[PDB]
Design a protein around this ligand. Structure first.
Ligand code: MG
Ligand code: MG
Ligand code: MG
Ligand code: MG
Ligand code: MG
Ligand code: MG
Ligand code: MG
Ligand code: MG
Ligand code: MG
Ligand code: MG
Ligand code: MG
Ligand code: MG
Ligand code: MG
Ligand code: MG
Ligand code: MG
Ligand code: MG
Ligand code: MG
Ligand code: MG
Ligand code: MG
Ligand code: MG
Ligand code: MG
Ligand code: MG
Ligand code: MG
Lengths: 205, 114, 157
RNA sequence: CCGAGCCUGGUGAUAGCUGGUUGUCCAAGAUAGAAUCUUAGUUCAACUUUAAAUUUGCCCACAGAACCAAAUCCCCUUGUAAAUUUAACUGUUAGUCCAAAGAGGAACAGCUCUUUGGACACUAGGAAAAAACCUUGUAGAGAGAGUAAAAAAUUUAACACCCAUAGUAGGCCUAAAAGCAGCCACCAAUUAAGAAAGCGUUCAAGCUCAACACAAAAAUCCCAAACAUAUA
RNA sequence: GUACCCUAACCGUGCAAAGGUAGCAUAAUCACUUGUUCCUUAAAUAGGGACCUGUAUGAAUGGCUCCACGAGGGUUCAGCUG
RNA sequence: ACCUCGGAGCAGAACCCAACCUCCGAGCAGUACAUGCUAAGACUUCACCAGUCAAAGCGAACCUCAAUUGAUCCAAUAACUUGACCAACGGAACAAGUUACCCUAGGGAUAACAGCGCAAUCCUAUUCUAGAGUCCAUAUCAACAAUAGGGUUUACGACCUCGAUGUUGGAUCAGGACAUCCCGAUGGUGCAGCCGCUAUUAAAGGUUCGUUUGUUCAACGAUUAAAGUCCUACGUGAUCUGAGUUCAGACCGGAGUAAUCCAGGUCGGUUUCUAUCUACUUUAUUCCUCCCUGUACGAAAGGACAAGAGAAAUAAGG
RNA sequence: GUUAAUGUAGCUUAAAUUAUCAAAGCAAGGCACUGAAAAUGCCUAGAUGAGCCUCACAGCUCCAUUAACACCA
């Protein structure tokens, strides 16, 4: 098995109690799968979103098609879809309960690695077919390396000390300077202005 | 005897207002489908519900009875259960004979008792 | 509208006035930065060994010829003891003063091929050359003595 | 002008429903809920008003508040002048948008439902016009003054040149698959050219490469005018 | 549920007071419905004749023929006419 | 479907906190038989009613469980006590249908029509190259996906209007968009030619007549250069119609004990205005025939352009 | 479309846990032989797939199955 394995539509034990749209599994930085384990190339999520089962066959069928499975291998860094998402039978008025369970979905936060690659190849062998996989994901994504994930980290850490602005977001947000926490969320104390909804802004120091 | 299917394509579904059997809801509603077959000439309408999610899925169920006569003929599952379920009406009016014949043999033997 | 949306949600104006004030401002310098101030070493032995050993060297413009005929022009001097060498001018041109060849230096531009030997045949080579009416032979050097294409007629006859 | 005549009477029928409700000036004043044949209503709270009585009210610091995030509760000091209790009642209990945390829906709605907080149902300035965003609240006259918020920035895709011999049609399987169907090996000739990286031939042939050599489209008619250069 | 030029339940039963007979028939008769077919038309969701479960026909809730008749409701030949 | 009560989540940490929100329960059972009596001080389901905990003391001894429920009046009984799936659970002592024969009061607090919001649905364009196209992703088409834009549909929402904003089709007159059906210019072609396919640009002009049906549609007959797609309160009823829908009558099939009822069917059925105000009330296309020429094109069958001549037709003005 | 009901040995109902007898089929057992009357066994994935305990029981995954409402403008 040196290829991406099949990911099923539903959990084998189907979830029978419905869940709220707990949208704060999209919002913010990721805490699981931010670092590299067994690989050199991956697809970083630069934004939050939900992976349906169609994206899992977008990713699997176009990685097993453009890959040397003798020399490269690949590994899922997201689970199979688990979070049930309901839909009401169409045409109905509002109310009358929650809808029935339609399908499942995987929450991906920004900074998450989605699919990892490896084996014996350079980044330029893999940057070809992974960048086109990443553009068809429901969020902003990107092919990174081990070397270009730290080059994106040390450069952004450079932007924090290099900038000549006396006023950063994190200084105004915690000191509550202009009464600014009237407008901000309580998560912008920890997001520090780099996140707005599910969107991640890397041009913000 | 299953009814032979129809492709997802080649079906010119128009949506018009249609007949209106109601006050103001049914003049302005494009509820009537005109689900066509492009190969054969079989034009099917439907105003069976006030909802296309049961109009169109039932308009498809009618069309796969009409175009079934085209590609099979009078020996089809759409005429089998017309000649099998009106087979019983010759087993219902003949059945009803033989008991209205033996309801006079027991009615004349009645009251000719003494 | 929720907190996490499909579309980038509009901000409050006091928030958007803050996401303009705290933007990244890069350092701008005083003066712009740009506006201020084995393979060779082995061939650093071989042409030095060409000029210690050989007697008659002949230089030319041999890029002129086909893939078959340059093997043949190699083979037309294989019947003698003439061998033909090519060298990089990025490594052959500095050596000439390290072996003190001033009148051979303004001579190596473009494609140039040495045609070294230890005994000249080149009386017959010009007869081999007389059927390819291009490919002209330039100035040689025998034992620290230049000889032009005229110098290869005064000696070689 | 008959689903039960017409007149008079009971009769000023009743209406939780609609409409109306008349001098001047001033002041205090806005949105927890619960029950209800009730949710178009009402009673009690809550908020509000007036009078009276007394003494603490608000803001708050250590310490303190459970196991299976923002904050609050408590609370002396301090900064403040208000609070509770008593007396007497009315009204409001058919709300909105914005920021935030969520639930429902489609991570739709100027959507619906709670929670914390604003503003509006009151004034003035601004965002073009503008209930809800920002600035600012305590009243008058002035042909004084200083300010507050307050004006959108952007303009992108050129590119190599030269040059190509060879152990061989490497072997395998294959009709033959020859660098390029497929499997293994992937060495090697010369200064330098992969047992071939894309095309291409049934197969070949051939053409190259790697190699030495020098962002937009909609229905009456675009929508201030205009403007790169005078010192904060 | 065995009937085969698509044809003998040719047999087992459940339930009822009784299980719809003659006749008529896509009808002014739930839907499907513009049923299928022939005539009529250059062309027919109309008209007429047929077939037919009509699963919601049907016998004084009267059923079916039919004579006259109707400011009834459809169809039509010829004429005729802004 | 639901209505009263309890536990968990939403509601992370004092308390509180909705939902036709998400998941579990309850309408008892068991053991006592001091499950006797009294009484400080508190709690409290945001009110009241109810509901909780309780030191001491008297008398004795040496409750379990989250909910496990029901007020008043009355009825029983000598008394103690007892009495509701009063479950619409703060409970009227006891009351259903139906109305198109309908009535009054109101409501845009609340639906249908229109508008507006939104864009799931719908339509369209780019992105990605899997796949078809003998080979070849890109002549043509196109999966899983992604990014946008539209505002035609079916929804949803309930913001304006219920002291009235009258409608389907048709008639009449059409205004506009272009996402082009025809006519024009161009790029590609799996373009020889002729036809086509697609793409860029083009809104000047054009966009037929019939049989059935109320029909927009659709089918069909005949044509056409072509018989565009939409928007205009599903343009247009103080200009028209009234076949449909949509009142009072009636039949049939059905539901119902009946009255009556059905998105059923079918016959019938009053469409009002004398214009105050704004606004307004004489600014050429195309087809065919000939010709070129039956040439170029092609193995042949077939069979072009541009230029020019004529015939007609509609439109405009006479 | 939506709830709502239903499933029984080969043949009919049962049984509110544990599965029956009533027919038919195996014969034998009273009777000269046939008939019951007996005395047997017999055949139910209790129409599904998972197991929450331990379940035709109490419920979905289920498959077919029939009823019934999908309205007003
Ligand atoms: Mg009164
Ligand atoms: Mg009321
Ligand atoms: Mg009023
Ligand atoms: Mg005041
Ligand atoms: Mg204090
Ligand atoms: Mg709202
Ligand atoms: Mg002042
Ligand atoms: Mg090269
Ligand atoms: Mg008469
Ligand atoms: Mg209380
Ligand atoms: Mg005590
Ligand atoms: Mg009640
Ligand atoms: Mg109550
Ligand atoms: Mg009537
Ligand atoms: Mg409203
Ligand atoms: Mg509407
Ligand atoms: Mg509302
Ligand atoms: Mg109205
Ligand atoms: Mg009015
Ligand atoms: Mg265009
Ligand atoms: Mg209209
Ligand atoms: Mg009008
Ligand atoms: Mg009449």
């Amino acid at each position: 098995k040196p290829k991406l394995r099949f990911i099923e539509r539903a959990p084998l034990v189907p979830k029978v109690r419905r869940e709220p749209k707990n949208l704060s599994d999209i919002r913010g930085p990721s805490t699981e799968a931010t670092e590299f384990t067994e690989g050199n190339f991956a697809i970083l999520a630069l934004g939050g979103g939900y992976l349906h089962w169609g994206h899992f066959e977008m990713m699997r069928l176009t990685i097993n098609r453009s890959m040397d499975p003798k020399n490269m291998f690949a590994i899922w860094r997201v689970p199979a879809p688990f979070k049930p998402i309901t839909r009401k039978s169409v045409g109905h008025r509002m109310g009358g309960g929650k809808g029935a369970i339609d399908h499942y979905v995987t929450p991906v936060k920004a900074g998450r690695l989605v699919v990892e690659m490896g084996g014996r190849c350079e980044f330029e062998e893999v940057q070809g077919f992974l960048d086109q996989v990443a553009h068809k994901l429901p969020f902003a994504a990107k092919a990174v390396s081990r070397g270009t994930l730290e080059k994106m980290r040390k450069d952004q850490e450079e932007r924090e000390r290099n900038n000549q602005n006396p006023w950063t977001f994190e200084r105004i947000a915690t000191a509550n300077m202009l009464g600014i926490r009237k407008v901000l969320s309580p998560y912008d104390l920890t997001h520090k202005g780099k996140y707005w909804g599910k969107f991640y802004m890397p041009k913000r120091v | 005897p299953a009814l032979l299917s129809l492709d997802e394509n080649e079906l010119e579904e128009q949506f018009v207002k249609g007949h209106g059997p109601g006050g103001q809801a049914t003049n302005k509603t494009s509820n009537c489908v005109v689900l066509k077959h492009i190969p054969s000439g079989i034009v099917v309408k439907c105003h069976q519900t006030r909802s296309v999610d049961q109009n169109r899925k039932l308009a498809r169920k009618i069309l796969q009875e009409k175009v079934d006569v085209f590609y099979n003929g009078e020996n089809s599952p759409v005429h089998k259960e017309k000649r099998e379920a009106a087979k019983k009406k010759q087993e219902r009016k003949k059945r009803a004979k033989e008991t209205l014949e033996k309801k006079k043999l027991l009615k004349e033997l009645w009251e000719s008792s003494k | 509208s929720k907190a996490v949306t499909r579309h980038r949600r509009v901000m409050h104006f006091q928030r958007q006035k803050l996401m303009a004030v705290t933007e990244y401002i890069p350092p701008k310098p005083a003066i712009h930065p740009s506006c201020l101030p084995g393979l060779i070493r082995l061939l650093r032995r071989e042409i030095a060994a060409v000029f210690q050993d050989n007697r008659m060297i002949a230089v030319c413009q041999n890029v002129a010829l086909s893939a078959e005929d340059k093997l043949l022009m190699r083979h037309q001097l294989r019947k003698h003891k003439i061998l033909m060498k090519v060298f990089p001018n990025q490594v052959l041109k500095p050596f000439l003063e390290d072996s003190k060849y001033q009148n051979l230096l303004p001579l190596f531009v473009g494609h140039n091929m040495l045609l070294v030997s230890e005994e000249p045949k080149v009386k017959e080579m010009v007869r081999i050359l007389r059927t390819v009416p291009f490919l002209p032979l330039l100035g040689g050097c025998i034992d620290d003595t230049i000889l032009s294409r005229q110098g290869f007629i005064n000696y070689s006859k």
